[PDB]
C-alpha cells in the first residue's frame, strides 16, 4: 500500500533540500527518523515533519503496523519565486530571487 504526504511552498531552495533527501532514500522509517534527528541542517526539520505526517496517515487511514514501513520514494520540486530589489553602489539596482520548493514522501509496507 502507498501513502503520501506533501509540503508545498516550503521556504527553502530545492538544491539545499535535496542534500538531506538522499540520506534516507530506501531506508526503514525507524532508522530514518534517528538519522534525521542528528543532522545539523535546517532542511532536516522540514523533512522529518513530512515523514512523521506520512507515517501517521498510513497508520490511521489505511492499515496499521508502522513496524514494516520503508521509504520508497522521495523527491523535491521547485515552487514559485518571489522577486525583490537590492540597491547597489552608484545608483544601480539588482533583482533578488527567494526560491521555494515542494516536498513529497511516499512510504509503503511493501
Amino acid at each position: 500500500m502507498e501513502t503520501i504526504a506533501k509540503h508545498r511552498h516550503a521556504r527553502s531552495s530545492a538544491q539545499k533540500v535535496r542534500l538531506v533527501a538522499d540520506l534516507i532514500r530506501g531506508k526503514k522509517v525507524s532508522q530514518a527518523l534517528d538519522i534525521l534527528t542528528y543532522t545539523n541542517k535546517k532542511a532536516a526539520v522540514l523533512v522529518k515533519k513530512v515523514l512523521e505526517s506520512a507515517i501517521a496517515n498510513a497508520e490511521h487511514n489505511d492499515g496499521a503496523d508502522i513496524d514494516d514501513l520503508k521509504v520508497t520514494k522521495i523527491f523535491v520540486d521547485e515552487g514559485p519565486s518571489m522577486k525583490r530589489i537590492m540597491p547597489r553602489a552608484k545608483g544601480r539596482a539588482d533583482r533578488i530571487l527567494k526560491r521555494t520548493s515542494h516536498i513529497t514522501v511516499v512510504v509503503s509496507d511493501r
Binding site: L19, V20, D22, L23, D34, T39
Partner: peptide, 21 residues
C-alpha cells in the same frame, strides 16, 4: 563531492537505554 554523511552509529546508555552520540 558535495554529498553528506550520516553518523553511521549511535550508542546506548547502560541504565536508561536511550540513544545518544
Amino acid at each position: 563531492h558535495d554529498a553528506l554523511t550520516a553518523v553511521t552509529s549511535l550508542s546506548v546508555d547502560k541504565t536508561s537505554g536511550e540513544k545518544h552520540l
